[PDB]
Tab-separated table of C-alpha atoms in Angstrom:
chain	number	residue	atom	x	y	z
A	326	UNK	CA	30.375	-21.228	10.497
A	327	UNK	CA	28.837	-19.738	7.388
A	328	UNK	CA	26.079	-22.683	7.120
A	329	UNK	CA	25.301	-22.141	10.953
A	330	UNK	CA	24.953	-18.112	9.592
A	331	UNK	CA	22.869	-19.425	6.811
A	332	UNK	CA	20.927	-21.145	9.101
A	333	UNK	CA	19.972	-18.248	11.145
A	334	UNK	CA	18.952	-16.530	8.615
A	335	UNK	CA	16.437	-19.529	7.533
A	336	UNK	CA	15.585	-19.779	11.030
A	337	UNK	CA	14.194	-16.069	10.897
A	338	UNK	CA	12.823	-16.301	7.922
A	339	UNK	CA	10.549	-19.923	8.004
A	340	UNK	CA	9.810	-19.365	12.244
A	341	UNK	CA	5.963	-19.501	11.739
A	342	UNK	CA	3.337	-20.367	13.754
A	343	UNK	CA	-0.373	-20.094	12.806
A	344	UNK	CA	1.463	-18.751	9.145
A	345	UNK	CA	2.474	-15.635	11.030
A	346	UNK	CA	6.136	-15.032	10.872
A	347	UNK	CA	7.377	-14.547	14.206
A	348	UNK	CA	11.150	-13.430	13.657
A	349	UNK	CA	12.243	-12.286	10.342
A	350	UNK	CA	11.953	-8.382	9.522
A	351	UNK	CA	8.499	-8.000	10.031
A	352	UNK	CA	8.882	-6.068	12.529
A	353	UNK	CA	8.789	-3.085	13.346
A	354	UNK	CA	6.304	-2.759	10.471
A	355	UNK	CA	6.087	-5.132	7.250
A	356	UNK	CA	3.754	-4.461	4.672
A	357	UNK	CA	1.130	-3.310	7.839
A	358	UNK	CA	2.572	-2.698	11.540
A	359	UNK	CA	0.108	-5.518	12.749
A	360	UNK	CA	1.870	-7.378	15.322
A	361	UNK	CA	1.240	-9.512	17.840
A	362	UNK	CA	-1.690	-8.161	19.782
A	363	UNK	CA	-3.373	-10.532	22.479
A	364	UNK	CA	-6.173	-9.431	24.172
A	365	UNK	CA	-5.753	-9.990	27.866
A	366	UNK	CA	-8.762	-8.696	29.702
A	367	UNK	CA	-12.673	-9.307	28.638
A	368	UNK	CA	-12.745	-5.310	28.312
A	369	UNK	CA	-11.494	-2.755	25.629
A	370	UNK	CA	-8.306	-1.033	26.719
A	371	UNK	CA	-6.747	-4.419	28.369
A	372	UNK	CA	-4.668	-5.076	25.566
A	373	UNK	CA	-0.937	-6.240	24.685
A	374	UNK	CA	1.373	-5.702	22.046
A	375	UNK	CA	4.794	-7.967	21.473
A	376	UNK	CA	7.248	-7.466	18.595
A	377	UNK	CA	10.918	-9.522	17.625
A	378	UNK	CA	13.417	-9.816	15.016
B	319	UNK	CA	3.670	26.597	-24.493
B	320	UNK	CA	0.695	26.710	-26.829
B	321	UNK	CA	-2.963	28.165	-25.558
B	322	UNK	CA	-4.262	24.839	-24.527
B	323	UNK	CA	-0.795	23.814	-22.668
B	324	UNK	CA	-1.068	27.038	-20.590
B	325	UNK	CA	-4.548	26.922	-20.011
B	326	UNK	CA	-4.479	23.117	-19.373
B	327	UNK	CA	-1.604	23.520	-16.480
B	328	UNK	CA	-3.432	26.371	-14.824
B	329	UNK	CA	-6.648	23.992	-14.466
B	330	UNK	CA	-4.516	20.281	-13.483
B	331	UNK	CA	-2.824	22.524	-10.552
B	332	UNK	CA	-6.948	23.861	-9.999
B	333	UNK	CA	-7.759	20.459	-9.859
B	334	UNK	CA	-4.906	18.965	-7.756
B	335	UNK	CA	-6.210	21.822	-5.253
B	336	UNK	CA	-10.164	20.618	-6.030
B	337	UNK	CA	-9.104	17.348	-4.661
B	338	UNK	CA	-6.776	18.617	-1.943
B	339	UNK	CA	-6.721	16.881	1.313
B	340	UNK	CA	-9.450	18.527	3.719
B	341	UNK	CA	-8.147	21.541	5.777
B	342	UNK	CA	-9.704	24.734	7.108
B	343	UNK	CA	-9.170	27.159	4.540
B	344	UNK	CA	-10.568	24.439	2.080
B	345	UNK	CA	-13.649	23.944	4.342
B	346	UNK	CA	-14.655	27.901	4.856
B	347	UNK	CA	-14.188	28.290	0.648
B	348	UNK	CA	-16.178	24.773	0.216
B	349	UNK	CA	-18.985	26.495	2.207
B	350	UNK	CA	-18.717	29.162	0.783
B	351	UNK	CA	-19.408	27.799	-2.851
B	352	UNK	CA	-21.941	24.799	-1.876
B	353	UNK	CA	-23.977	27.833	-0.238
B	354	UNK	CA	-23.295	29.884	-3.427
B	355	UNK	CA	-25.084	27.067	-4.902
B	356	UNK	CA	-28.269	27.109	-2.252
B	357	UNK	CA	-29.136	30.654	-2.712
B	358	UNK	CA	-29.921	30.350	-6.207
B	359	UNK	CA	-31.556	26.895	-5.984
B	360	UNK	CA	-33.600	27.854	-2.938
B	361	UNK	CA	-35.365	24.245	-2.597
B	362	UNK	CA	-35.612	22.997	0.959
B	363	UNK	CA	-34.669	19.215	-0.161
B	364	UNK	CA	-31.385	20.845	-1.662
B	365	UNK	CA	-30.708	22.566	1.552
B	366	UNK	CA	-31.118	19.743	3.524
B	367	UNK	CA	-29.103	17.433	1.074
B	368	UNK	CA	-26.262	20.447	2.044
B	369	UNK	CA	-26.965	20.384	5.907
B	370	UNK	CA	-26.113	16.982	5.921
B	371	UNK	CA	-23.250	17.092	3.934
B	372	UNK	CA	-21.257	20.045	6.098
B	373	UNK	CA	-22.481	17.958	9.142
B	374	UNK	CA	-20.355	14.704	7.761
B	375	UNK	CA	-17.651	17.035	6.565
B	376	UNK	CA	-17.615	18.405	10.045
B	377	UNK	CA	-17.431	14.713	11.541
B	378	UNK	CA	-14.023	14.382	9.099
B	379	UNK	CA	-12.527	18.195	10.440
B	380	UNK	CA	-13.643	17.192	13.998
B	381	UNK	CA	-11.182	13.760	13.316
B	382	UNK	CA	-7.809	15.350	11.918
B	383	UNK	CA	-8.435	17.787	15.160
B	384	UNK	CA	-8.801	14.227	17.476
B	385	UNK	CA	-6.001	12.295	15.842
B	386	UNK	CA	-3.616	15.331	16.283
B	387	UNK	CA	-4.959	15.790	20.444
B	388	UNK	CA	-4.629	11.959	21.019
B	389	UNK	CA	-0.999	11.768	19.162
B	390	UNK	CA	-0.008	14.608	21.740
B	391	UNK	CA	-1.167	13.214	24.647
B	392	UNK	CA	0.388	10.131	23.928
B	393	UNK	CA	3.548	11.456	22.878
B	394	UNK	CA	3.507	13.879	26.417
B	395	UNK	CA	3.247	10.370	28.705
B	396	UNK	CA	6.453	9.595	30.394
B	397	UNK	CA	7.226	5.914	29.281
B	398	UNK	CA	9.448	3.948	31.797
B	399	UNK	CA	8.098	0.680	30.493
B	400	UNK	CA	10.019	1.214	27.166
B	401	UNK	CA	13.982	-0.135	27.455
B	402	UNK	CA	13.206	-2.844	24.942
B	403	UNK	CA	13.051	-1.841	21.375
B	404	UNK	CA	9.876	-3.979	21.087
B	405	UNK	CA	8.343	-2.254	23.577
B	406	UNK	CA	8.574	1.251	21.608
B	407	UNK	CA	7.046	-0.876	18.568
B	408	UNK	CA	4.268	-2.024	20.975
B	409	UNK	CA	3.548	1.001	21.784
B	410	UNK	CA	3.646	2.344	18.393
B	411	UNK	CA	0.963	-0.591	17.449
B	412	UNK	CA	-0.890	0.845	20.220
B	413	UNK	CA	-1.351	4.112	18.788
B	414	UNK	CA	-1.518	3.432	14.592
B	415	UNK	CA	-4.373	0.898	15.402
B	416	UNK	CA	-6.379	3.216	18.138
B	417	UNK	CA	-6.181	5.718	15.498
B	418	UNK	CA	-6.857	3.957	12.423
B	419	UNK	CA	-10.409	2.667	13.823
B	420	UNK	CA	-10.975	5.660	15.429
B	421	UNK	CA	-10.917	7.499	11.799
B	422	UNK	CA	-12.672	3.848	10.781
B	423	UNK	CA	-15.773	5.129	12.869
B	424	UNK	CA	-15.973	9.021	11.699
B	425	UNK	CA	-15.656	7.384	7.945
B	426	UNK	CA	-18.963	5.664	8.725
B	427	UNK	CA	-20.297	8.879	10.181
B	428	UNK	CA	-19.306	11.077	7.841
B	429	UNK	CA	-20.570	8.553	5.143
B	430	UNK	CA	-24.114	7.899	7.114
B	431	UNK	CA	-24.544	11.677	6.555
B	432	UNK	CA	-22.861	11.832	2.960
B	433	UNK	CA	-25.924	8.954	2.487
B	434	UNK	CA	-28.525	11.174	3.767
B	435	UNK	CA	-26.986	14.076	1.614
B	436	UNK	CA	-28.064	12.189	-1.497
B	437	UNK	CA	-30.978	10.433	0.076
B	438	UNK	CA	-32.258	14.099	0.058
B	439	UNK	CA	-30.997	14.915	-3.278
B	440	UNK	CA	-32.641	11.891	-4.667
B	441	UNK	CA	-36.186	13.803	-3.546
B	442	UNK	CA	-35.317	16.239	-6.554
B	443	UNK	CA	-37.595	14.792	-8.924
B	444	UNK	CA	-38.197	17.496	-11.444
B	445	UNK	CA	-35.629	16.789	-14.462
B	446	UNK	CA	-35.204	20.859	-14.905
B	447	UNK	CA	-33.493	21.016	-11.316
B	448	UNK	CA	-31.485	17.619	-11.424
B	449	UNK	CA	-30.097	19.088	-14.670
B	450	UNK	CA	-29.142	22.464	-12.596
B	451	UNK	CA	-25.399	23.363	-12.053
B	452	UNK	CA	-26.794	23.822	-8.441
B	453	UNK	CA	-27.595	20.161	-8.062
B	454	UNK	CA	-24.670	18.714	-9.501
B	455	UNK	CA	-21.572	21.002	-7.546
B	456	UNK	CA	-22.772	19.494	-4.474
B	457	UNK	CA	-23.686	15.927	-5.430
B	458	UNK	CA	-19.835	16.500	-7.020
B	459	UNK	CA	-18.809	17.720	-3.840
B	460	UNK	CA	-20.403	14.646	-1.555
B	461	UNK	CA	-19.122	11.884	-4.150
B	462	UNK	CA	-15.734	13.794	-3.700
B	463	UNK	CA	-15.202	13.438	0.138
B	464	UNK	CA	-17.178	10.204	-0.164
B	465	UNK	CA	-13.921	9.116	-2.564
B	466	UNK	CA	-10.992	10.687	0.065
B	467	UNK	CA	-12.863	9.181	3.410
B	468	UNK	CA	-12.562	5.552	1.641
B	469	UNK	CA	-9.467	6.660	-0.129
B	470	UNK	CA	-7.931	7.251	3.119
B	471	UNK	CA	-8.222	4.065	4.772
B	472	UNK	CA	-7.297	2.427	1.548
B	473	UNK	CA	-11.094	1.084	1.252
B	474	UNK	CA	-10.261	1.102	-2.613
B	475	UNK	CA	-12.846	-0.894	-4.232
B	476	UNK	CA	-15.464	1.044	-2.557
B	477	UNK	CA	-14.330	4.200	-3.961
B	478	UNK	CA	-14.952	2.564	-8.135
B	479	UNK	CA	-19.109	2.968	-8.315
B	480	UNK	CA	-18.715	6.483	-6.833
B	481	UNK	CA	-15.787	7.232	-8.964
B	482	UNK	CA	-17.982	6.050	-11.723
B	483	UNK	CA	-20.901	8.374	-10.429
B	484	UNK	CA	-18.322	11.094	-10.165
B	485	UNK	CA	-17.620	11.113	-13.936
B	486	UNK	CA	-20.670	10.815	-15.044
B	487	UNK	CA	-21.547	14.555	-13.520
B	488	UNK	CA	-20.889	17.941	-15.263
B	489	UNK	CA	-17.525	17.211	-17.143
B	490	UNK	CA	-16.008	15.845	-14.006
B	491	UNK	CA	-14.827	13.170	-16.838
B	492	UNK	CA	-11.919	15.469	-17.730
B	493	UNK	CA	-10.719	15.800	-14.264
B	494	UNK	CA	-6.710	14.499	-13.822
B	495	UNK	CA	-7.278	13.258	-9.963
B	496	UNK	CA	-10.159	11.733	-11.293
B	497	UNK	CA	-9.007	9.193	-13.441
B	498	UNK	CA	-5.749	8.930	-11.406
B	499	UNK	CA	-7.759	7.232	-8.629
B	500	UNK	CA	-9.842	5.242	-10.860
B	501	UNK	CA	-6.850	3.678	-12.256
B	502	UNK	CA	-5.153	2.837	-8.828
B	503	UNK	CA	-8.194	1.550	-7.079
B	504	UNK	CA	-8.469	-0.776	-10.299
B	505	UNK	CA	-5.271	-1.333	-9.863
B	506	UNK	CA	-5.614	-2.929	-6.526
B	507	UNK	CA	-8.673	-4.672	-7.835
B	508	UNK	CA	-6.771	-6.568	-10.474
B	509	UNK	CA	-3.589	-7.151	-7.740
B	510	UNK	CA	-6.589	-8.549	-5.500
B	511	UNK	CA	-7.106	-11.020	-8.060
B	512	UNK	CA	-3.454	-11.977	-9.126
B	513	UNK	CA	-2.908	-12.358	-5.216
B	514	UNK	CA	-5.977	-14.256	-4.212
B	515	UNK	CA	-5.713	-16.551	-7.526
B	516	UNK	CA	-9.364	-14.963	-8.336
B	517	UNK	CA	-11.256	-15.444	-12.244
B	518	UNK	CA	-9.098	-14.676	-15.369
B	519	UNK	CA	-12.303	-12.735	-16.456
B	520	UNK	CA	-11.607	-10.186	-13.300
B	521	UNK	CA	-8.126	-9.788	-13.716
B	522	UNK	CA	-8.369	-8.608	-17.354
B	523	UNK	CA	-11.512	-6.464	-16.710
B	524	UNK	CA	-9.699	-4.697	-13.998
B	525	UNK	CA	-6.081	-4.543	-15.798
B	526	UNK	CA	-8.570	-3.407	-18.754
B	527	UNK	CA	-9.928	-0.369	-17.183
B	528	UNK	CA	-7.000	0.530	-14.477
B	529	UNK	CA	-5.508	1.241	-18.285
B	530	UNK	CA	-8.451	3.362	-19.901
B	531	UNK	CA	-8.067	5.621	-16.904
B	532	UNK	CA	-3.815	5.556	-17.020
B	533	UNK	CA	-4.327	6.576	-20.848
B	534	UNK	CA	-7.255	9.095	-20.268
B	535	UNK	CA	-5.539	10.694	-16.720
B	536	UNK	CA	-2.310	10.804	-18.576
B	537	UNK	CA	-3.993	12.411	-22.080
B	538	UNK	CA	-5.832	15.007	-20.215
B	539	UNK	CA	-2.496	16.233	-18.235
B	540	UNK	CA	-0.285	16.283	-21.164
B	541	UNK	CA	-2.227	15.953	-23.971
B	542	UNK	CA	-2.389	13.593	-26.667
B	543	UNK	CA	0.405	12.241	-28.731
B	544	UNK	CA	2.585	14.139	-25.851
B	545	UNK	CA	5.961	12.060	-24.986
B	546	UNK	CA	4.279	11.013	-22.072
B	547	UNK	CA	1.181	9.993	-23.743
B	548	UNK	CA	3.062	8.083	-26.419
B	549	UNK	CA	5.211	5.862	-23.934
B	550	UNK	CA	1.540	5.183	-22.447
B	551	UNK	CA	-0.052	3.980	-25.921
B	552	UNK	CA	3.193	1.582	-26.402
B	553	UNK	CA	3.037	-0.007	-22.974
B	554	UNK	CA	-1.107	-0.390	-23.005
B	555	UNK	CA	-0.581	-2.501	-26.741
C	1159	UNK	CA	36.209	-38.155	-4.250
C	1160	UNK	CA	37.717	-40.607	-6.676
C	1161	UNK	CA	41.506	-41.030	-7.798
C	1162	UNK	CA	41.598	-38.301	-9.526
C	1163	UNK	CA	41.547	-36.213	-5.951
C	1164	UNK	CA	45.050	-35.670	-6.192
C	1165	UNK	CA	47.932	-36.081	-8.329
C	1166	UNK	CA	47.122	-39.486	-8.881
C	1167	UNK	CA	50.700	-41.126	-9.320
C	1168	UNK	CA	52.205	-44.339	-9.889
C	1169	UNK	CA	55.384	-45.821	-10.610
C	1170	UNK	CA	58.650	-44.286	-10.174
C	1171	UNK	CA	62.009	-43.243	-11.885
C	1172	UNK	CA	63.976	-45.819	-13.318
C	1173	UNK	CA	63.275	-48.961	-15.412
C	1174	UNK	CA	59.661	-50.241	-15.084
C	1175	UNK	CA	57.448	-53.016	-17.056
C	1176	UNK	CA	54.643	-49.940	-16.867
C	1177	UNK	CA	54.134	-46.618	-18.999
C	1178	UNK	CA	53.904	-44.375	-15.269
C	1179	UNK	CA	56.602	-42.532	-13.317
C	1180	UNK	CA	55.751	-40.642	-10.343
C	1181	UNK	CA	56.729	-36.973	-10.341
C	1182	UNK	CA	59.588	-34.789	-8.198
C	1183	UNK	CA	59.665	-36.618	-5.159
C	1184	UNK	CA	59.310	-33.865	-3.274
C	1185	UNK	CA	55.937	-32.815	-4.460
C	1186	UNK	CA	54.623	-36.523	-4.936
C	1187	UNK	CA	54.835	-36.320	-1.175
C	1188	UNK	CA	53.805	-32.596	-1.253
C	1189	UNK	CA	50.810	-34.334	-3.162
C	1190	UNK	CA	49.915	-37.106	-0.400
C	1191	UNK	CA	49.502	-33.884	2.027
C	1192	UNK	CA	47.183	-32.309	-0.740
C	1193	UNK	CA	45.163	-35.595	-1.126
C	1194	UNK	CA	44.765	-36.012	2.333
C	1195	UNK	CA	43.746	-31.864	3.065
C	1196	UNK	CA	41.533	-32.100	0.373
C	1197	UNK	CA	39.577	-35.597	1.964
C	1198	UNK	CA	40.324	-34.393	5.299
C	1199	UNK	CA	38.915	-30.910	4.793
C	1200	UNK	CA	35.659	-32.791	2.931
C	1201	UNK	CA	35.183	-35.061	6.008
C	1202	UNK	CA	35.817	-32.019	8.390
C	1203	UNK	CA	32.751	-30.819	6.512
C	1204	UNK	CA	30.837	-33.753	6.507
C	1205	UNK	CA	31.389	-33.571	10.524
C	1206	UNK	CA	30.545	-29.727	10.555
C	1207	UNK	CA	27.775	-31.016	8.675
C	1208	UNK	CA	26.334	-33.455	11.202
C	1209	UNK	CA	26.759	-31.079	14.107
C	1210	UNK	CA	24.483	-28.994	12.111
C	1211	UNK	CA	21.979	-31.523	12.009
């Protein structure tokens, strides 16, 4: 049990993709609050934001 | 106390208040003095330099009175699409970033009309009114909200050459806030370089002169050879 | 793992042609449990181990 905990907590920590961490404590704010914004529409205003940890 | 010590706390707390986050008090008083310093200067390139400057202070007042509407109206929209704790975040993102560029574009405004401000100044030529009290309060006074607008939205390096102009003018080199700001914008100069693996040559010129400003912000607050100065002079060695 | 895991004994009360007696019979076989927890308990993590993987 306590390597499977271990291994969540690696699991959070190393989850990258494109070098941005997508699980640890980032969120709701790390050293900025930027997050994952996509932009949806071709317009301003048609935007997303997703956070996780 | 001694003399100095009194006299030197009565002008750090004037000068804490000198650099004092813009409000409305601190804008009527401002206008106030910067006009104090066109009616006895009464040159029309002086009064322009001015016009522009209130106009890109005006631009900055304008701002805190947006950011403080659009946080309301936000705040006053009923948010059924929030059960997940991301979702608040998202929505939080939302806001910080709408705001943040928001004050991003009255920076540039305010800084396009700072520009003018000395654009006009700079039509002065006559050395016996660019060496007028006049002339240098409100170049003082443009560098200064020049410095906070960047300051603000932690534009840092851009706030050094104006810094530098800043100090240059009037005895402005014995100001506190001054130097305080000197020394943390070099800081983050020299932590740009240690982060971004930059020249040895930058990191030691910026860790050179974040610590001329630490020793000279912290000598002109306490005074020299001062407990506080003395821990400085160990660590600088 | 290695002999020395356990109370590694040998020989037993009595006349012998060695230089070894085993120990209280009771905890020599005390001691075969402990050997075998202490192998069994490394192979249990060995097996905890590979389920990780």
């Amino acid at each position: 049990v306590s390597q499977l905990i271990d291994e969540v907590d690696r699991i959070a920590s190393q989850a990258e993709f494109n070098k941005m961490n997508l699980l640890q404590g980032d969120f709701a704010r790390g050293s900025r609050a930027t997050s994952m914004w996509f932009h949806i529409g071709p317009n301003m205003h048609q935007r997303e934001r997703v956070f996780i940890a | 106390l001694t003399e100095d010590q009194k006299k030197k706390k009565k002008e750090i707390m004037e000068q804490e208040s000198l650099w004092k986050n813009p409000d409305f008090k601190g804008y009527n008083k401002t206008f106030q003095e910067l006009h104090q310093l066109s009616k006895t200067f009464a040159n029309n390139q002086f009064r322009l330099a001015l016009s522009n400057y209130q106009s890109g202070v005006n631009t900055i007042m304008k701002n805190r009175d947006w950011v403080e509407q659009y946080r309301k109206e936000e705040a006053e929209k009923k948010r059924l699409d929030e059960k997940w704790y991301w979702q608040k975040v998202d929505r939080k993102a939302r806001e910080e970033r709408v705001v943040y560029r928001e004050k991003m574009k009255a920076k540039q405004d305010a800084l396009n009309y700072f520009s003018k401000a000395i654009n006009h100044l700079d039509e002065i030529k006559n050395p016996d009114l660019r060496e007028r009290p006049e002339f240098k309060r409100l170049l003082s006074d443009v560098y200064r909200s020049w410095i906070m607008a960047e300051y603000d939205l932690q534009n840092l390096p851009q706030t050094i050459p104006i810094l530098e102009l800043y100090i240059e003018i009037d005895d402005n080199e014995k100001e506190y806030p001054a130097h305080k700001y000197l020394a943390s914008a070099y800081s983050f100069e020299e932590n740009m370089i240690k982060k971004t693996k930059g020249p040895d040559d930058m990191l030691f010129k910026y860790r050179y002169k974040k610590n001329v400003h630490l020793l000279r912000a912290t000598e002109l607050k306490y005074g020299k050879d001062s407990p506080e100065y003395k821990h400085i002079v160990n660590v600088i060695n | 793992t290695m002999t020395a895991r356990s109370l590694n004994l040998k020989g037993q009360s009595g006349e012998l042609l060695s230089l070894s007696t085993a120990d209280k019979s009771n905890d020599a076989i005390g001691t075969l449990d402990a050997a075998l927890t202490r192998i069994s308990k490394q192979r249990a993590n060995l097996g905890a181990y590979f389920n990780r993987l």
